[PDB]
């Protein structure tokens, strides 16, 4: 039936997810649990270990690091979007608006793969920067990353897979309720198909878990505000720091947005 076409969509997206994003949740958890024959990542807990870590101002340096990686994330996400059947056939200005609002929602979503209670995998799973260390940074940078950690501890509880995430992400990108879209119909047309693919995915991949799908759509709505909060703290950081240069691509996104 249609059920087959939805499984077909799921695999397509997973495959383009796995191509587009080099460090999967599976790879990431394997590192974090230690259940791997790779060397455990260089832990970063203070300014000293940061400095020894650089091999493989401080708070500005870290945020500059965070920023250069955000841009690579946007590049990867934009590449993945193009693989979502029919995303490219949309109006190019819509394509831009969907990405503009989506990327930070997805960055949060996928960061959670990379983190746990105590810290976050960095530099393609080779560094492990602690939550204690990021808190300890001075305002405004102290509490920049903490909200991501708080989200991630709840989101990760849902125990989603790379296959689940691939579709979830596609669903977030194709949200027809973004400010300034010009042709909402075809966006919604695809988000319907994706949501169905998502519902089936969860039923098949997690038959033990009922209403993961419902729980998961509830998270997707938290995320929009969490992303708003985040965008506001960028507005704070841009203004109060004369020494801090925002990256262009991040401006493009930040500008006019909430």
């Amino acid at each position: 039936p249609e059920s087959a076409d939805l499984r077909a969509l799921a695999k397509h997206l997973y495959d383009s997810y796995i191509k587009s994003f080099p460090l999967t949740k599976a790879k990431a958890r394997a590192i974090l649990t230690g259940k791997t024959t790779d060397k455990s990542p260089f832990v970063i807990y203070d300014m000293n270990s940061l400095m020894m870590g650089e091999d493989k101002e401080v708070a500005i340096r870290i945020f500059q690091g965070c920023q250069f990686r955000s841009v690579e994330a946007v590049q990867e996400i934009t590449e993945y979007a193009k693989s979502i059947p029919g995303f490219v056939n949309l109006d190019l200005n819509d394509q831009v608006t969907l990405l503009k609002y989506g990327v930070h929602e997805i960055i949060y979503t996928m960061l959670a793969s990379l983190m746990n209670k105590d810290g976050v995998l960095i530099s393609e799973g080779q560094g492990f920067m602690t939550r204690e260390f990021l808190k300890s940074l001075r305002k405004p940078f102290g509490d920049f990353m903490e909200p991501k950690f708080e989200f991630a501890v709840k989101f990760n509880a849902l125990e989603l897979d790379d296959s689940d995430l691939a579709i979830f992400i596609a669903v977030i990108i194709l949200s027809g309720d973004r400010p300034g879209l010009l042709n909402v119909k075809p966006i919604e047309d695809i988000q319907d198909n994706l949501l169905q693919a998502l519902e089936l995915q969860l039923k098949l991949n997690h038959p033990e878990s009922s209403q993961l799908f419902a729980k998961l759509l509830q998270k997707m709505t938290d995320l929009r505000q969490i992303v708003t909060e985040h965008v506001q703290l960028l507005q704070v950081i841009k203004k109060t720091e004369t020494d801090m240069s925002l990256h262009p691509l991040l401006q493009e996104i930040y500008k006019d947005l909430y």
């Binding site: 946007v74 590049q75 934009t78 193009k82 190019l92 394509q95 831009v96 990405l99 503009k100 262009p248 691509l249 493009e252 996104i253």
Partner: peptide
């Protein structure tokens, strides 16, 4: 939004 357009194409 140049870069985004450039990235999209």
């Amino acid at each position: 939004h140049k870069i985004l357009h450039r990235l999209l194409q």
